[PDB]
């Protein structure tokens, strides 16, 4: 019941295969809107993203989809952990650089295992996130609605 399988590729940091699972507002048609390999082209401060997200909500013209990335093999998990640490240690989110036509933005959010879910994504509309979990990379997908 995964939505998408592909690469996350951040040059000179980590490249690995992951499955994306639904968390909130993430229909399976997202598979059509994600490339084979998500290219991480930048980093951005979380507060800047949350400010943007509340303007996005006010516009009524986008859908905010949250997915959970899972490494597919033990080798993938090693790189997944590198990339989590890259963003976590800098207090940054990743920014995708190669979005398909229907995707306005995609951000990569490191969610610590005991972290509280960043409040703009609450509440989830979908399976949500379990309380007991590893360190996670979430994908915040800003998709064209109308």
């Amino acid at each position: 019941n995964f939505i998408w399988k592909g690469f996350i590729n951040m040059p000179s940091v980590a490249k690995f295969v992951t499955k994306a699972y639904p968390v909130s507002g993430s229909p399976e048609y997202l598979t059509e809107d994600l490339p084979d390999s998500i290219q991480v082209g930048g980093r951005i401060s979380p507060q800047t993203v949350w400010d943007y997200v509340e303007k996005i909500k006010a516009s009524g013209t986008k859908e905010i989809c949250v997915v959970r990335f899972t490494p597919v093999t033990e080798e993938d998990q090693i790189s997944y952990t590198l990339l989590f640490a890259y963003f976590s240690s800098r207090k940054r989110y990743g920014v995708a650089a190669n979005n398909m036509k229907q995707v306005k933005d995609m951000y990569l959010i490191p969610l610590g295992a005991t972290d509280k879910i960043p409040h703009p994504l609450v509440p989830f509309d979908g399976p949500g996130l379990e309380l007991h979990r590893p360190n996670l990379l979430l994908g915040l997908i800003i998709r064209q609605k109308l």
């Binding site: 082209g41 980093r43 993203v49 920014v95």
Partner: peptide
Amino acid sequence: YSPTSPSYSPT
């Protein structure tokens, strides 16, 4: 009305 994506630092 369409908010512009915020700038970010490239890596």
